[PDB]
Structures are given as C-alpha cells and as structure tokens.
Amino acid sequence: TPEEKLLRAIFGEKASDVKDSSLRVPNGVSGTVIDVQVFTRDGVEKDKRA
Amino acid sequence: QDVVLGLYYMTRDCVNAKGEGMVLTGPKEAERLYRSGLASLHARVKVRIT
Amino acid sequence: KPLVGTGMERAVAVDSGVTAVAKRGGVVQYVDASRIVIKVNEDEMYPGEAGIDIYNLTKYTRSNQNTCINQMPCVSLGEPVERGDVLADGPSTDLGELAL
Amino acid sequence: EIKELLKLGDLPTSGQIRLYDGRTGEQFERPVTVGYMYMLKLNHLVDDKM
Amino acid sequence: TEFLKPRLVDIEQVSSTHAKVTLEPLERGFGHTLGNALRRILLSSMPGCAVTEVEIDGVLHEYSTKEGVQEDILEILLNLKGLAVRVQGKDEVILTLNKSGIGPVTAADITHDGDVEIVKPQHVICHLTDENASISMRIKVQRGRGYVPASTRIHSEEDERPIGRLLVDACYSPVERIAYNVEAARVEQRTDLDKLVIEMETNGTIDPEEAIRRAATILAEQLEAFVDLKPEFDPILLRPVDDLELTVRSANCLKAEAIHYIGDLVQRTEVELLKTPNLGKKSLTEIKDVLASRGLSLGMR
Amino acid sequence: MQGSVTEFLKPRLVDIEQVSSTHAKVTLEPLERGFGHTLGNALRRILLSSMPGCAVTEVEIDGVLHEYSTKEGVQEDILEILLNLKGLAVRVQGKDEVILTLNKSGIGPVTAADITHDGDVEIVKPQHVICHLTDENASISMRIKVQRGRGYVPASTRIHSEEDERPIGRLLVDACYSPVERIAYNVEAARVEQRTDLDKLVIEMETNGTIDPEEAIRRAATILAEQLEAFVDL
Amino acid sequence: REEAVVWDILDEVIREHPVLLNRAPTLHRLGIQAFEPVLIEGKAIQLHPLV
C-alpha cells in the first residue's frame, strides 16, 4: 500500500521478505520451561541447540 | 433457599427467653437493642410501628 | 492421607503402577530423589548373581492432559523392606494409600 | 462408635461447636457443626474454562 | 513497609440526624475492624442524657390510669424515652410538667429555663380529653452511658426509694442507629481493598460529625498505654457555676451568656462581663468576690 | 481551650505469661463490660493479618536451574526443599534484606544450624529439616534471601517487580510473612477491689517465635491509633 | 501491555454499557438477561443470586 511504501522510505526500508511464525506461549498461561526437545528430519544439519 | 431461612429466623416467636414487653419507637430500637445481649430476636414484645 | 477412609485405598494405589513397589524384599542400600537401590538380603535369584535391585522412579513428566505425574522416595536409607510394600510414591498416594 | 471416638478425643459428643464470627467476634446463636471432610479439587477449573 | 490511611471522605447528610460516611482507601478487614468497633462504641458506650425516673400524681402501682388521659401509663413512659436532652453541666436535673386543658401537652409545656435544652419542643407526650383535666409530674433526668434496662435496676436494687418512682429504660446515648458496609474498594494498585460506609442516625443531642468524632476519640483514649513511642486540666474548673454560691441574678447571667462551667467564667475578661444583659456592678463585684475567695481569678487563659 | 467532658478507666498491661517460645498469654486487667469484647475481636484481626515478619523470598541454588529438577544424593526434589524454606523462623536485627548462605556436605540431614550463621540473624529453630544428603560426596550450596514484609506476597505477585531479574538460577519462593497463627481472647470478669463491673481481656496467642508478645500487641494497637486518626476530623 | 492507564479507560467504556448474560438450556425469555458490569479481579463470572 503506497502509504506503507512511503512509511518505509521514510524510516529506512528494511522491507523484509520473510514472515513470522514463532511458537508463542498462548496468552493467559505462564510458567517455567522445564525441558525442550528437537526431532530434526533424517538428513538435515542438526542445529546448534539440536 | 439461603435468604429465606434467614427471614424465617427473623420471625418465629419464641417462649419468653430474653424478652419482655420493653417497648420503644420504633423499629430502630430492636437494632440498638439486639446488639448486644438485649436480649434476643423472637422475643414477643410490642413496639410503636408507623 | 484421607482421614476418613474406607480401607480399600491401599489396594488401589498399588494395583495401578503409579506407585513403585518392591519386586523382592531386602534392606535398602541407597535412596535418592532420582532412584532407589535395595539389597535383596535373602534367597535371591537361583544363581548367586548380583543380589541388588534398582528402581528408577520416573519424575516430573506430563500426564494425559494435563496433570503432573512424578514419584518420590518414601523410604529412608538403611531401612528393612519386605517384598510388596511402597518404595516410591506417585501422584495422589501417601505411602500405600490413595489420596486424591 | 463415632461418638465413642469423640470421647477419648476429648471432644463434644455431638460434633457441634460454638463458633464466633471473626467479623464481629460475636457468637453464632446456634452451635454449628464442625469437622473434617476429606475433599478434593476437581478438574473443570478456571484458567481453562474462560 | 507501612500502612495507608483513608483519603476520600464523603459525608452525605440525609438530615442533621441521619447521615452516611464513606472512606474509600482502606486495607483488608480494616473495613470491619473499625466498622464493628465503632458500632459497639456508639450503640452502647457514649455520653448523652435521657429519662430514667418518672413521678406522676395518683398513679402508684400496676401502672394505673389517670383520668382524662388518652394514653395509659405505658404509652406515656414511651414518649418520655424519646426526649432530646442536652444538659449544660448537671449530672441530675429534676423537671416538672404542669399543664391542663384539652389538647396535646408537648415538651414545651415543661419548666424550661435554663440548664437543659430540649431539641424537640413538638415531641408528643400526652393528650388530655376533657376540659377539667390536669396532669402534673416530676421527671428525673440523669446523664449516663449505655441503655440501662428496667430489669437490671430493680433486680439489684441496693437501696431504692418509695412509690411514685416509675422505672424507665435509660436511652443513655444520642445514637438511634449504627450500621456499616464492606464494599470492596477499587484502588489502581490492589483489588482486595475495603471502603467503609457508616450509616448513622441520631437524635438532637449531637450531630453525626461529632458523634463519630467523639466515638473514635473515646476509642483512642483506650490503648493509650500501648502505643510504641495533652495533660492536664484542673478538677474544680470542671464544675458548674452553681458551686460558686452567688446570687440568682448572677446565676442567670452565666446561664444566659452560655457560661456553663466555671472554666468559662474564669476565662472571660471583665470587658465581656460588662456586655452581659442585666449585669451591672452589683453582678460584677459579686463575681470577683466569690472568685477571689477560692484562690482563683477572673480573665485567665 | 475548653472543654468538654470525660469519663473513666483506661486499660493497662499486666502479667505476660510465656508458656514457650511460641505460646503466650497477655492480659489486660483494667477494662469495661464493654471493651473486653470490643477490643478482643478488634485486636485479633489486626494481630492475625497486619504484623511485620521475615520469610524466605528468593533462593539461588548451585547446579539447580529450575525448581522442578532434582540433585544427586538428595532424598527430596527441589520443590520440597523450597517448601522447607517457607518455614524458616528468622529474626533480623537491623536490615530489610539479608542474604544467608548455606553450605553442607556429607551423608546426613542438613538442619537450619548448618547455615553460615550471622550476627544479625537469630534462628528460632536450628533443628529445622531442610535436606537429606545420602551420598558421601553429596554437597549443596545455596544463597538464601530473607526479606522483611507483611501479607503473604506470593511469587506470582512479584513478577512485575522483575526489573531485569535475568538470573535463571534464582528460584522465587512464596512469602508467608505474618508470624501469628492463632489468636484467642477471653473476657473473664476481673477482680478489681471496687467498681464490681470490670473485666480482664485475656489474650492467648501462638506465634512462630520470631516476634515477642510485647511489641506484637503494640505495633498492632498502634495501627488502630493511626487508623482512627482520620476519624476525629472529617 | 496492560499499562494501568488502559484499566481506568476500561472503567469508562463499560460505565453505562450493559452486558447480556445467558445460560446453557435457554428455555424461556428470562434465560437471557442483561446486566451492568462491575469489574472483578478474578477469572470467574459473578451472578446476582435472585436471578
């Protein structure tokens, strides 16, 4: 939208091509994280934290 | 249920037990009287009602 | 414990595997919030092979949506236990008895 | 045999006790029942049903 | 670290007798700590005056009837309890009501003037029927505290007096009604806060503003020997002007100039004692003579 | 500067019988019909809630990241230890925040005495059970933080007071501040020489030890004087 | 971010703004009845015991 396109060339574009889909803790509940787990696909580079 | 058994207790005359014909005017005495020890609800006593 | 009970609550906690019961009875060698090890102390397995038993007492894992199932040691070290009494206790059980 | 266990417990043989308010500290006119009911918290709790 | 005080003080006067007071910011249960404590104070332990003894002519025993009187004896004892009495300085005053003829005989028909002030002159007391009717009585008022029932006085009568003394319960208080609300108080920091709502009704002996004040001040005199961490007055200055033993002209001068106790006469200069009606030099030399005779002076502070 | 009117009988403090370090019997002899029932319930409510106290609020333990784990050679898991620290009977001399360290190794229970003692901190129950080490090489070290407050102030209340509380090893533990458990009062008409109508307010009281009956009644009563202060004028 | 200035404004947006409640088996017209809201700091919904 041209109003948005103006607002980015006003404040520095940095117009990202990637969206956000992070896993956010649902609003209302809250506690401490006691363990994490990752099952990486067979044949993919196991991450640092993985 | 709850509020009715309460108003049934605020009624229900009792054989003379901390109650004589000590009258006053009007409803206001029973509240000054009943607190405290003078003498009981269901006391069988006249008072001036308007 | 449920103060006013029925007497059945023992056989309910122990029949469901929620509590960890002794497989064969001896004297407790080592307890821990992590696991329990017990010296069988009398007529163990037919060959004289490694008397001790070891129980692991799962801790702090999620249940089916969503309660918390863990176990705790209810016996102190150096205490003689016979086969078939509570060594570790689980959710809503108090040393043999069920406590919801 | 319940009342027989209120004896030897040095307790009233009625399971009734005189309680005071704590709001007013005044006495509740009738002696109420007081005792130990084993209770449990159910599922169906709020933080999920809201 | 420490505690908070009430801030929003709203006083709605439904009348000069009935009033509601609300005080918003208050901590947990303090709504009930004060509200029930101030209740037990005003309902029982307070100053004030009311009728305690009656003496009427002819009616002695069984509360017999007086001729030509619409209401029997009990219905007379009733209206007497409800007499708004605010006394100058007297701890016992005998009054006499003498009135005759048809019509209502109110409290204005009593011997007024001047140490006792009635706040309800149209208080209905009796109604006489025939033209040849006349009622007379000596009513004994006493300044007391509480609500003294007739049962407790006769049961434990250590030494009482003969017939004509009709025992009436002492309305020894200005308070006609005391109740309090709870009303969880919304303060932007904590939710679990109280706001006390005091609904008070009283007679004319005192207003709500001073009744609550005098009640809470009475509570602060308690526990005075407990605070972590002005006195004092004199005992004779607390006495009425009747103890100076002066003339009747100089007694009404102090009666009319609103000089109740000698603690007020002793602190009024002669400049103001010359502006008092019917107080010449015979009534001013008499003042300074009976004052200098008891080691006291005139015009002190 | 006048007047106006007055009456009799202020109350005073008499024999304060100590039955133990927790149980006590305060008595007030010079009282009315009257105020023995008015003050008894009005004192109980302020004593039972609004008294200062010190309890554990935060506990950092070495090698323990979250309060749901275990530690080797410890009979009890971490939550059980945190619940034994709620019941610490601590009296602080002159601070509002004292960091008490606790180190102890070897097989055996770790009682309250095994804390690194402090001159400002008296421990009312050194025999308190905190741990159970079961391995000869078991060793535990923690930095307890005792604070001074009032009103149970649970852990969920004080996440807004985080202000970058980033340290992950710091376990937050619930406060249970007020040191008063039970409060009773009796009327028990008093034996004064004259004025036959006088009662003695007998306050029985069971506390946790971290407060003496004397200042407990005085801090409580002073609150009423401050509270009633706004009642005189309006 | 519940910034405590929002709360006071929430008090103003609900002031004389009714809110209708409703129970599960809606048998008769009285099964839905509107009320004025009083903000309560709990997660439960509070009801007048006469209705």
Side-chain angles (χ1 to χ4, degrees):
Chain A
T1 325
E3 299 79 340
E4 308 180 5
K5 196 193 294 299
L6 161 74
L7 185 136
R8 295 211 149 160
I10 286 184
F11 275 82
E13 47 277 62
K14 200 206 194 70
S16 180
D17 62 274
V18 80
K19 204 177 186 184
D20 161 61
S21 184
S22 41
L23 176 69
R24 316 168 173 285
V25 48
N27 197 291
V29 306
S30 50
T32 71
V33 183
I34 88 164
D35 178 43
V36 309
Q37 222 45 66
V38 50
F39 309 140
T40 173
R41 183 176 193 185
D42 200 351
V44 184
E45 284 189 4
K46 302 190 173 177
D47 177 58
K48 281 189 179 164
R49 183 66 210 267
Chain B
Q1 40 184 260
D2 222 292
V3 54
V4 174
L5 165 144
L7 286 186
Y8 167 102
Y9 202 101
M10 286 191 75
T11 322
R12 181 109 170 71
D13 46 71
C14 189
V15 198
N16 276 289
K18 294 197 237 166
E20 282 196 0
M22 27 194 304
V23 311
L24 241 184
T25 73
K28 299 142 212 323
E29 173 203 31
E31 191 149 31
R32 305 182 297 261
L33 218 46
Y34 174 56
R35 327 156 173 188
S36 192
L38 305 172
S40 163
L41 301 178
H42 41 247
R44 311 241 304 280
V45 46
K46 335 179 170 190
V47 283
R48 274 223 294 178
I49 277 75
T50 301
Chain C
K1 269 150 264 174
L3 260 283
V4 53
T6 46
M8 201 97 268
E9 31 275 61
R10 203 161 299 254
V12 194
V14 86
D15 274 330
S16 186
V18 47
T19 191
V21 53
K23 275 183 302 184
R24 46 169 125 88
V27 183
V28 163
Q29 169 180 139
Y30 169 81
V31 296
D32 195 323
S34 288
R35 72 185 136 275
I36 282 182
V37 194
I38 166 176
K39 182 70 173 180
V40 159
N41 154 266
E42 198 198 308
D43 67 279
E44 41 274 5
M45 59 292 277
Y46 168 83
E49 35 192 32
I52 50 88
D53 293 313
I54 170 184
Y55 311 167
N56 275 321
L57 63 104
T58 49
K59 278 203 87 92
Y60 287 73
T61 79
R62 97 167 186 142
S63 165
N64 283 241
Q65 282 240 331
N66 252 333
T67 70
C68 163
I69 176 156
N70 91 331
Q71 282 176 293
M72 288 166 201
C74 72
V75 61
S76 199
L77 42 63
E79 186 176 308
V81 294
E82 278 293 329
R83 181 193 82 157
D85 37 40
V86 278
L87 301 214
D89 254 28
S92 293
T93 174
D94 194 294
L95 50 93
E97 297 162 48
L98 164 152
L100 321 174
Chain D
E1 332 167 271
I2 296 200
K3 265 122 171 52
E4 176 160 329
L5 260 283
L6 294 166
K7 310 292 193 191
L8 185 103
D10 184 63
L11 283 161
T13 167
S14 63
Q16 271 106 359
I17 289 167
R18 299 229 137 188
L19 308 196
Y20 313 150
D21 194 322
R23 294 195 166 282
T24 70
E26 291 176 358
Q27 183 194 244
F28 293 107
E29 316 188 323
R30 178 176 278 87
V32 316
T33 308
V34 172
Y36 275 95
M37 178 179 312
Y38 190 63
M39 296 192 41
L40 41 75
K41 165 181 175 181
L42 286 192
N43 234 316
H44 305 211
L45 64 156
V46 201
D47 302 288
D48 306 290
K49 284 173 181 184
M50 163 184 147
Chain E
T1 299
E2 288 322 303
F3 296 97
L4 81 171
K5 332 243 171 178
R7 259 171 285 281
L8 199 279
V9 178
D10 179 88
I11 298 172
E12 73 142 346
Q13 301 179 28
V14 198
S15 74
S16 62
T17 52
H18 192 252
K20 269 193 187 175
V21 197
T22 66
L23 313 170
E24 187 138 328
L26 247 182
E27 236 173 49
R28 240 199 201 164
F30 287 60
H32 264 51
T33 303
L34 326 178
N36 175 60
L38 294 200
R39 186 191 74 170
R40 298 183 58 80
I41 278 304
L42 293 136
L43 273 180
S44 35
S45 316
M46 272 285 278
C49 326
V51 172
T52 70
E53 301 178 32
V54 195
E55 179 163 26
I56 322 169
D57 297 314
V59 286
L60 291 186
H61 267 264
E62 274 269 30
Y63 292 163
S64 48
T65 320
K66 185 97 84 83
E67 312 288 325
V69 188
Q70 173 172 7
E71 31 266 30
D72 42 288
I73 274 297
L74 279 181
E75 296 202 32
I76 310 163
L77 290 180
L78 200 36
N79 301 103
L80 291 197
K81 282 184 186 174
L83 282 170
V85 180
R86 190 217 277 248
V87 182
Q88 153 164 130
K90 310 190 297 196
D91 283 319
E92 178 176 353
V93 48
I94 323 292
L95 296 185
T96 55
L97 206 182
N98 288 19
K99 224 276 190 174
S100 63
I102 315 188
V105 281
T106 75
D109 298 1
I110 322 178
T111 48
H112 30 265
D113 272 48
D115 290 337
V116 179
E117 174 202 345
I118 304 173
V119 201
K120 204 180 179 185
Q122 67 279 339
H123 186 55
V124 175
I125 304 185
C126 280
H127 280 79
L128 308 169
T129 50
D130 64 343
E131 295 280 348
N132 206 80
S134 203
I135 49 186
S136 186
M137 71 184 58
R138 308 128 177 163
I139 298 159
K140 180 174 307 193
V141 190
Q142 291 177 9
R143 171 119 64 187
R145 174 173 301 174
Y147 191 79
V148 187
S151 64
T152 52
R153 312 176 91 221
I154 278 302
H155 262 55
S156 179
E157 261 318 318
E158 51 246 17
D159 42 68
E160 89 306 320
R161 246 74 66 206
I163 329 294
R165 281 324 196 276
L166 295 316
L167 199 75
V168 70
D169 306 323
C171 274
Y172 273 163
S173 169
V175 179
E176 292 178 10
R177 165 101 94 85
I178 278 304
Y180 60 96
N181 300 272
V182 200
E183 277 207 59
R186 314 296 307 152
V187 178
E188 289 178 11
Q189 36 192 8
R190 305 178 269 172
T191 166
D192 43 328
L193 293 193
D194 293 356
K195 71 180 147 159
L196 187 41
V197 177
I198 279 187
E199 184 175 3
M200 160 186 286
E201 192 177 356
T202 181
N203 68 359
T205 316
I206 210 182
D207 42 80
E209 294 242 5
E210 193 76 2
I212 294 190
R213 170 185 207 284
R214 200 118 56 184
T217 297
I218 277 166
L219 199 43
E221 287 269 331
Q222 253 53 239
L223 59 62
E224 185 185 28
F226 302 147
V227 188
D228 282 317
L229 291 324
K230 244 200 70 165
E232 187 48 271
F233 224 67
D234 260 299
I236 277 282
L237 280 80
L238 301 170
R239 241 179 195 82
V241 278
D242 301 16
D243 291 270
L244 304 179
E245 292 149 37
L246 40 74
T247 167
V248 196
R249 169 166 298 264
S250 298
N252 296 125
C253 276
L254 316 175
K255 175 190 297 299
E257 204 55 54
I259 290 193
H260 298 52
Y261 315 106
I262 64 167
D264 289 86
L265 174 61
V266 80
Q267 66 183 3
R268 294 332 260 151
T269 166
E270 285 180 70
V271 182
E272 327 289 338
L273 270 178
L274 191 68
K275 311 306 171 185
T276 305
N278 292 335
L279 206 165
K281 201 194 300 295
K282 285 285 179 184
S283 308
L284 202 292
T285 299
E286 171 68 2
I287 282 299
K288 303 176 301 183
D289 290 332
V290 303
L291 256 54
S293 79
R294 301 272 84 177
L296 262 78
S297 170
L298 185 58
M300 323 190 301
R301 35 172 66 101
Chain F
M1 210 191 304
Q2 293 230 343
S4 68
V5 278
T6 181
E7 209 70 51
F8 302 108
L9 278 161
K10 292 172 298 277
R12 260 168 288 278
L13 169 63
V14 182
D15 201 69
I16 290 191
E17 169 192 10
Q18 306 285 328
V19 187
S20 86
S21 84
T22 71
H23 207 258
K25 269 194 180 175
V26 186
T27 42
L28 319 181
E29 195 164 355
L31 280 161
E32 307 274 37
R33 261 233 173 259
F35 304 146
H37 261 168
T38 292
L39 297 172
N41 170 253
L43 261 171
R44 165 191 224 253
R45 194 193 314 288
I46 295 331
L47 282 175
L48 259 177
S49 91
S50 294
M51 296 295 308
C54 294
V56 175
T57 88
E58 313 174 14
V59 164
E60 182 162 18
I61 301 180
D62 286 313
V64 178
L65 270 168
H66 60 61
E67 77 188 305
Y68 302 93
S69 185
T70 49
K71 209 164 194 177
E72 297 315 305
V74 188
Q75 184 157 35
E76 322 105 0
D77 39 33
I78 279 300
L79 266 191
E80 186 155 13
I81 294 130
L82 281 203
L83 263 57
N84 290 112
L85 292 168
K86 252 185 237 185
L88 255 198
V90 156
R91 194 201 312 245
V92 167
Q93 178 204 358
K95 315 166 190 176
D96 294 343
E97 173 175 349
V98 62
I99 313 275
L100 296 198
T101 51
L102 194 168
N103 299 33
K104 202 270 183 198
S105 314
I107 297 167
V110 177
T111 59
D114 300 26
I115 204 172
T116 59
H117 333 98
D118 193 324
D120 325 300
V121 167
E122 152 195 7
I123 281 171
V124 183
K125 179 69 170 311
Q127 323 164 207
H128 199 52
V129 169
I130 297 195
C131 262
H132 263 69
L133 307 177
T134 56
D135 177 66
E136 193 48 87
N137 300 245
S139 57
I140 38 174
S141 187
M142 61 197 44
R143 300 90 147 196
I144 315 193
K145 169 183 320 176
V146 171
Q147 287 206 242
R148 161 125 50 210
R150 153 193 91 247
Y152 169 69
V153 194
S156 312
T157 283
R158 270 178 49 259
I159 277 277
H160 74 326
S161 303
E162 264 213 10
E163 215 67 359
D164 314 347
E165 88 157 51
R166 306 303 96 178
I168 48 186
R170 286 227 145 177
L171 312 177
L172 260 157
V173 71
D174 286 348
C176 292
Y177 272 146
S178 168
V180 201
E181 261 77 351
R182 318 187 329 177
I183 283 296
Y185 62 79
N186 309 72
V187 179
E188 296 199 16
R191 319 288 301 178
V192 188
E193 203 66 71
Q194 288 302 129
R195 283 291 299 270
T196 170
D197 189 13
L198 291 178
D199 301 353
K200 49 147 181 177
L201 168 60
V202 170
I203 294 193
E204 186 184 343
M205 155 195 307
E206 190 174 357
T207 192
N208 74 358
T210 73
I211 192 175
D212 62 298
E214 282 266 22
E215 65 168 353
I217 308 274
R218 293 199 170 180
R219 273 162 185 184
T222 302
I223 299 160
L224 192 42
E226 291 179 14
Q227 219 61 47
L228 293 173
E229 195 179 14
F231 281 173
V232 185
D233 60 84
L234 317 85
Chain G
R1 308 146 31 207
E2 324 177 51
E3 207 178 341
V5 186
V6 48
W7 296 100
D8 300 323
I9 291 304
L10 181 67
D11 268 337
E12 175 193 10
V13 309
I14 71 104
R15 253 285 295 146
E16 273 168 356
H17 195 154
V19 152
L20 51 152
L21 271 59
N22 163 35
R23 186 168 191 266
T26 295
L27 280 315
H28 64 190
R29 145 193 160 171
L30 298 182
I32 279 75
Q33 281 192 89
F35 287 80
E36 276 204 7
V38 188
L39 267 304
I40 167 175
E41 290 256 337
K43 265 173 102 103
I45 182 174
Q46 283 201 327
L47 188 38
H48 195 221
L50 284 197
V51 300

